[PDB]
Symmetry: C5
Subunit: 311 residues, 5 copies
Amino acid sequence: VSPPPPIADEPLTVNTGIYLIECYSLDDKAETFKVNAFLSLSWKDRRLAFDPVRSGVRVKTYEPEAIWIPEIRFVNVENARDADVVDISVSPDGTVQYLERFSARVLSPLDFRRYPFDSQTLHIYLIVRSVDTRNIVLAVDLEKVGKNDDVFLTGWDIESFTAVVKPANFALEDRLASKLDYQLRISRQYFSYIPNIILPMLFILFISWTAFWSTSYEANVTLVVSTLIAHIAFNILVETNLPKTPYMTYTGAIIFMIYLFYFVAVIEVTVQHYLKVESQPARAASITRASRIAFPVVFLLANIILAFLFF
Amino acid sequence: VSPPPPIADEPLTVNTGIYLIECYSLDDKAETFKVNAFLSLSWKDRRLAFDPVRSGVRVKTYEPEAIWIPEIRFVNVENARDADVVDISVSPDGTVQYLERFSARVLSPLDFRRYPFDSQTLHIYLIVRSVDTRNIVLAVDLEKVGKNDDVFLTGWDIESFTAVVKPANFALEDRLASKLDYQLRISRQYFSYIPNIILPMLFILFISWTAFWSTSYEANVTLVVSTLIAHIAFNILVETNLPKTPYMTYTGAIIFMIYLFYFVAVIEVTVQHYLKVESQPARAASITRASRIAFPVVFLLANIILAFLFF
Amino acid sequence: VSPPPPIADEPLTVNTGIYLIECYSLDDKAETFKVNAFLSLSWKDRRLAFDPVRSGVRVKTYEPEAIWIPEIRFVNVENARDADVVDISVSPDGTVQYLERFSARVLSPLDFRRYPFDSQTLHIYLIVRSVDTRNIVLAVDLEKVGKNDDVFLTGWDIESFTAVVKPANFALEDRLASKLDYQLRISRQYFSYIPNIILPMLFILFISWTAFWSTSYEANVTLVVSTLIAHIAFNILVETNLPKTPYMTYTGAIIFMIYLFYFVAVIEVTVQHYLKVESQPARAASITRASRIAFPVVFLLANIILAFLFF
Amino acid sequence: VSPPPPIADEPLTVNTGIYLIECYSLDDKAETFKVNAFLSLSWKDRRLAFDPVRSGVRVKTYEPEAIWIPEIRFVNVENARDADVVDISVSPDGTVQYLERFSARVLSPLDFRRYPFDSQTLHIYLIVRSVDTRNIVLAVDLEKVGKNDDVFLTGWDIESFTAVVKPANFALEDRLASKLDYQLRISRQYFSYIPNIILPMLFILFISWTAFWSTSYEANVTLVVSTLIAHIAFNILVETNLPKTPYMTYTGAIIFMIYLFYFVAVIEVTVQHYLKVESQPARAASITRASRIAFPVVFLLANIILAFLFF
Amino acid sequence: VSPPPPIADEPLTVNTGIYLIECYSLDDKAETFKVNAFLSLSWKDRRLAFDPVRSGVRVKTYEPEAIWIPEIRFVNVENARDADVVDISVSPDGTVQYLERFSARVLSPLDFRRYPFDSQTLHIYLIVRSVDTRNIVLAVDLEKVGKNDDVFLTGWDIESFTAVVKPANFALEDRLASKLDYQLRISRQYFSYIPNIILPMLFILFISWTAFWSTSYEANVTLVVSTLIAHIAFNILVETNLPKTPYMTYTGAIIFMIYLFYFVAVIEVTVQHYLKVESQPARAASITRASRIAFPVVFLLANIILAFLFF
Ligand SMILES: [Cl-]
Ligand SMILES: [Cl-]
Ligand SMILES: [Cl-]
Ligand SMILES: [Cl-]
Ligand SMILES: [Cl-]
Ligand SMILES: [Cl-]
Ligand SMILES: [Cl-]
Ligand code: NA
Ligand code: NA
Ligand code: NA
Ligand code: NA
Ligand code: NA
Ligand code: NA
């Protein structure tokens, strides 16, 4: 079969629409998500036109084999989409109405800078390669673009599913290509991070600061070192749920900065002991008393500075 | 092939039934379960009707290819179901009796609020899209809905497998869709959680409270800090078997609250030491003696309050 | 094609046999195992009968497509078996001799009560659904049931592979079904558990009891708490290699009971210190001296009781 | 199609050869490896013979469908090999030269007794089932057996890829079978184990022995218990990279024996303290001084004994 | 179909080109990466030549089935590439222009010596086996070799995608083979390693050195042993993200060397205590004072030596 012939030198417009049925498995480490949707296509093939009076019928169904169907592909999919044709319906003027149900693992990158208080724009790119007979251009039929109400992405809030109506027309391997951008806007559900990582991590830090109200070196060493190990466990736990970024994430920055606080606490604990042993407990007392105010104040200000730079 | 023609303007009723053979792999993190069942369909196609006297046979078998079969799909499946046709049998009046065996990874969400003392309702949604010739409506043949006695879901108790007999009729891509709800009611086997997580977690907490019967700061610091680390391990172990929820789970609440008890224990231990050093052991004694009653009582009451709010 | 016609009202007997080639991947958590075997089938189709004098040949070979082959399925498989036909041979009387080589992930449940000193019976269920023309019944040709000598199931000892010769004939979706039970009896290789989990776990417990020969509270607290943490790690390690059971496993019981020994050791350590501080070292001495005999004796008796209840 | 006819009662010899392109994914836990190779087959079919003068051509190509090809299968593969026919070429005498490119997950067992200083022989078993017309026997065409120079198996050294030229001819499901053994000899690259597991494990043990030069019970308890926990971590890390064996591995034995050294160290530390407290520091001194020589000497001799038994 | 006939004895040149669409999943442990690209092929088949005047058309499209297409395979792929033909276009002279879109898991080895400051050259090997009719040789059409601007490999920087224009012509199973080398040059994004592994690891080491400003054996033992355990966790964490190499990696060397620093710190701590107890605090003071300079200086120089040897 060949593509529909042009009336003049005009390109063939294939109207598109994606309707999400099931949205699932957003892998932060892999920067992928799985989708299960409907793909609707519509174009005019004058060769298929018929008289509704003579033929009796208002629409004619066809099997994919019987007629010409444009080769529509997804750009950012991992492997080729699994698709099954739901319906093909031709109206008297020759307007074809194609529908298929597909599933695909889509590869759209993520920005972890404000993690876990981040929002993402997932992309689904539809493309079409022009044939030698005639050039093919994509379009968005807006009322065939949507999502099911049940659509739930675990640990995320689905904000919107829209399409950038103007296609990106460009050259690809010496032929015209018409690319379309479907955008799924989502925002992370940060709530769980607070009682599971943030608050436990702050509690262990504050426990390390009880060493500023203790003269026992043996006890202080235990307090600051033990809590430092628990902070290492939280750093490891966090960096497992995330990929290796060439930038600093919000949680990454806080976690890093907290190490400096543990390091300075070890210095103070060591200085206090050295001074007490050196028979200078007056000077050691001054340092310990100062640290009680310095550590919380510097921690609070440094966090104001970080939140400011990141948000 | 085309759909059966209507006697009048009535829709075509496709009677359905699902019979579970094997039920397995309930992923709490993914909110999926795997199923292996029979799907039975029945509708009347007058075009297939025959005289049993003239034809000799009481029923005629057909291959899927030969006749019209309604396109029935599952809504909440991950990928398209793996199905194999067992039998297609037509009675003299034209009543088709279709049977297929399928397997699918079903995506039904879970409510972890009462975890691990939770009960779930897993869903299997059957759907059918109306064609241009005539509208298709789903029905439940209750005699063809069931499950095998051997059906076992590891770590869960299977309560019931029933169907909501009235379908959800709605518009989908400008055509009528008839959705059916098959519900598998299950309840978690919480038994293992008691000797593996709950009792070990309470034992380490009670061990931390032996610091209220000790004047040794070095020993208390070791007792409260060491047991706090074991509690961190249990928090990490628990949050691995579960997904990130935008709400507080029952175990999540208990685990969180227990951190506060460790934090207050560190404060008491620090206060006792400061006072003893400051030559005020009488005041330190009062605080330590009070804590012995306060900590268990506040723990017991806070748990009564939590169990009340969650159940 | 249609099934062979009956001489009288007799059912069609399909003789079966399974010969295991490779047996592997027994997942304790999933209660599945993978199998690679031969499935042999034999039935008489008088329609295929031929004169060996006239046809030249003593046997005729056919492609699956050419003749009627009974639809034999496995009940407890995860997804549909991967099968490849090795041979189909028809003798002059019409006796068909079918051979296929298949691979499948079989879902047979396990009893972890005596873990890791448990024995299992894995099941492979063959089934056949009767057609409208005539009823089909399964049989076991014992000469075609076996296993290769090389058959090795990692971490398990293969005892026997036999078949329950009498099929389970029952109604399934309003038609007769003939089910057959192939049983693979295996027993766990418990050896590795002894130097990797059991002996390391006993060593750490006995180390905790060296606190009954020490008056140093600071040292005792370190001894009992540190070893309790190592026991937590062993409990976690063990519960990872196993699924969540609604019953107590043998190792589960020992692991649980050992927590009580750690808890009572903390009590003794605390009592000894309180008494020594309260200027009652005579009473503290009596308790410590008693514990030295009590702890090993109670541990030994409790283990005799457990081994008795479980075996 | 039927197999080639015999001149007399001789069997048909199918000459074989495997040439490895890519060798990868040796799973120690699963005892599997993945292979990507060429399979070459050659046999004489007199029916295909032709006169090169009359036909013009020196060789004739055929599609698998056109001619008879022996059913060659792999015994120890997991699932059926993925194969694609590269070429089929017939010489004037009727000698067929078949070539296919395949990939398979091969299941060959491993001997971890000398781990990580072990060498393995991976097996690829080719088999052929005799037909009723005539018996089929396998052979090795040695210059069609090889491997690519680039062939690399991560963490292993590939020594040789050869075939046991004499096939194993035996009865299988009442027909003759010709099995061939292709052996891939490999040896583990033990280098990484030394700086990552062996030396770190010895360092922590030697650190525990610094307790023989200390009279501080509190410090000794910390030294021996802390290092014992690090040894537990190494035991866990090692047993994860390996399957559960019914025998003792080399590393397994060393790891186990090291626990006894920790146990005896705890005993010595306890005895020293009891004696010092009991006002017998002279006797405690003798034991501590002896342990300084005993522990390293017994460790060194026990290791000589182990290396001897294992190598 | 047969290959194009030669004008004279010349070989057939198949011009190639790979254009990367999506590049993802670089597994360091497995030494694999997944690719999703276009494969373009071009060769002259005089049999397909046509007169553009008589035929009307300037180019003719063909289905893969209709014409002869060279069997091009990838050497270092895991399983056979997933490919879908985009276009086949013939010009009047008979020049065929083939285009297909494929996805494959490519197995290219990696050099971890400078990890995580390493650069890699990933390979994609295209090959072609000569037929009996005529020899086939590969070529690189440089205008049809490229990559998309959006091409992103998570945690890596894509430097270049080029091809070694001269093919490797060699014998394979007694026939000529033409191999082509496509090289994807990438360099690791080491940034994340600094705040997550390197700086945390140095902080814990420096904390261990605060024992040179302390006379408390009990505190020193806690300081050096606790920090040694955190270093063990970092060694384990690092060796999980990497495969077992027969050489020393950069991070591997630093990690190993740091163990020696912990071991010598334990010796110093032990010596200081023994001497103080032996009533030689003057000598213990000299050693402790020296260690304060020795440890940082030796650490800094040893690191200069390592960086020099590795870079
Ligand atoms: Cl696609
Ligand atoms: Cl479906
Ligand atoms: Cl609606
Ligand atoms: Cl409608
Ligand atoms: Cl099956
Ligand atoms: Cl095979
Ligand atoms: Cl390929
Ligand atoms: Na088409
Ligand atoms: Na149909
Ligand atoms: Na058949
Ligand atoms: Na054939
Ligand atoms: Na301590
Ligand atoms: Na072709």
